[PDB]
């Protein structure tokens, strides 16, 4: 068994002690941190220090009975220390998952999630988590010799591992497939008013002024859904409201589908078809000129195609599918059933009646909604903070949990025991989780860094009046 000096356990437990009370004191003393996310961080800080304090208390205890030399007092104080550690570890996971649930809802349903999660509601949830964790922690240590408990602890680590893997491929690997580029999709690249650009755009195609609906994508059957839009135009073409609408269909692909599209372009007059792929700069101008963009996709994993349109005031009419369903709300667009040309055509009729009011507030909601999905926004930065916190937890607890796997899968294997003999190294690594976590909050929260500086100045004054 690899020996580590008991001072190391007591030292790091003290550093983790002062660090985590500073975290709890700061959030409590700062009303600017009275949000559900920081409340769940506070519960993680409590479970962090309780693990490090118990481990430092355990090594101090163990050293004491190495000098006195009852067997019943050992088992009692051992089951109590280990139960506090077990309960805090379960709370450590529940708090991390609660931050994940907080981040997911603060990103896609921000206004809603803020209303249910009142300052009361966080209290019951955090208390309910610690109640179930303390109960489960005691039951786990009682049956610490059962294969069900060790497998239960192992399964909860693999879920945190799978969640960290999911967040890594989302926020880093595919950070670039669903991330909105605000440096390019900006209103500042436009000049004049909206009707100014729209009238100039409709004049470029030799067309009268009307409510403009625009489609851009690939011409295929059963994907981007241009076949649905062509059928929807044919439906509306027989109605009297068709004359007030203007349609700009852009795309290349199925030669029989554009021959369809080009046939209606020759049949009506308020329909313009462009069978080439235009530059992204022209697409940007069209987003700030047309009134609505129609995204009738059969399958759309990322709502990025919507976010770019809503950046320039374009109100999306998309299928409630994949990313479009999560991006577009009732205040920022119109959703329809995928593959339904009749349901689609009704949304253009709804958008036609909607255009008879002042849509400036609607377009401002779209710009504001798409703005909140920027990587530099507070929502994306919170999910990156959650990914750092879970990555730190997985790395710090991985050696201990591999040791747990070896304990039930190969305790006799001559080099499972070689890994198992370094158990003390995995213990101090566990306490490093409660030391790195406060540092993570500091470099990821600008407000928490400000409260930390106000305390070192009050701690510099906590010695003047102390000694004088």
């Amino acid at each position: 068994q690899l020996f580590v000096s008991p001072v190391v356990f007591v030292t790091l437990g003290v550093i983790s002690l002062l660090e985590n009370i500073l975290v709890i004191v700061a959030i409590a003393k700062n009303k600017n941190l009275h949000s559900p996310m920081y409340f769940f961080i506070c519960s993680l800080a409590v479970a962090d220090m309780l693990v490090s304090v118990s481990l430092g208390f355990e090594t101090i205890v163990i050293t004491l009975l190495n000098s006195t030399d009852a067997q019943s007092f050992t088992v009692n104080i051992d089951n109590v220390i280990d139960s506090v550690i077990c309960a805090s570890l379960l709370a450590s996971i529940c708090s991390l998952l609660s931050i994940a649930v907080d981040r997911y809802f603060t990103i896609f349903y921000a206004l809603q999630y803020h209303n249910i999660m009142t300052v009361k509601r966080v209290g019951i949830i955090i208390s309910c988590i610690w109640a179930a964790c303390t109960v489960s922690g005691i039951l786990f240590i009682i049956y610490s010799d059962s294969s069900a408990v060790i497998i239960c602890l192992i399964t909860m680590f693999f879920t945190m591992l799978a969640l960290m893997a999911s967040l890594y491929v989302h926020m880093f690997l595919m950070a670039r497939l669903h991330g909105i580029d605000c440096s390019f999709w900006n209103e500042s690249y436009l000049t004049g008013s909206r009707d100014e650009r729209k009238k100039s755009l409709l004049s470029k195609f030799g067309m009268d002024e009307g409510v403009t609906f625009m489609f851009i994508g690939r011409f295929d059957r059963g994907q981007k859904g241009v076949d649905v839009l062509l059928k929807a135009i044919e439906i509306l073409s027989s109605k009297k409201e068709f004359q007030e609408m203007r349609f700009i269909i852009i795309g290349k692909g199925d030669p029989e589908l554009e021959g369809w599209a080009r046939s209606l372009e020759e049949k009506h007059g308020n329909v313009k078809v462009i069978t080439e792929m235009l530059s992204r700069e022209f697409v940007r101008e069209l987003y700030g000129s047309v009134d609505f963009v129609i995204i009738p996709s059969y399958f759309e994993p990322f709502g990025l195609v919507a976010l770019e349109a809503m950046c320039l005031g374009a109100i999306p009419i998309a299928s409630a599918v994949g990313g479009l369903r999560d991006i577009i709300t009732n205040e920022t667009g119109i959703l329809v059933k995928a593959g339904d040309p009749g349901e689609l055509a009704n949304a253009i009729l709804k958008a036609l009646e909607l255009s008879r009011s002042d849509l400036s507030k609607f377009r401002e909601n779209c710009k504001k909604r798409a703005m909140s999905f920027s990587r530099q926004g507070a929502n994306m930065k919170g999910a990156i903070t959650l990914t750092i916190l879970i990555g730190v937890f997985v790395v710090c607890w991985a050696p201990f949990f591999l040791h747990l796997i070896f304990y039930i899968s190969c305790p006799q294997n001559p080099y499972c025991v070689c890994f198992m003999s370094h158990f003390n190294l995995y213990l101090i690594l566990i306490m490093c989780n409660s030391i790195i976590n406060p540092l993570i909050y500091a470099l990821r929260s600008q407000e928490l860094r400000k409260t930390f500086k106000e305390i070192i100045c009050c701690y510099e004054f906590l010695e003047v009046l102390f000694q004088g």
Binding site: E58, L65, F423, I430
Partner: peptide
Amino acid sequence: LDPXRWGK
């Protein structure tokens, strides 16, 4: 009475 649990 060991440091942590499952160390043995």
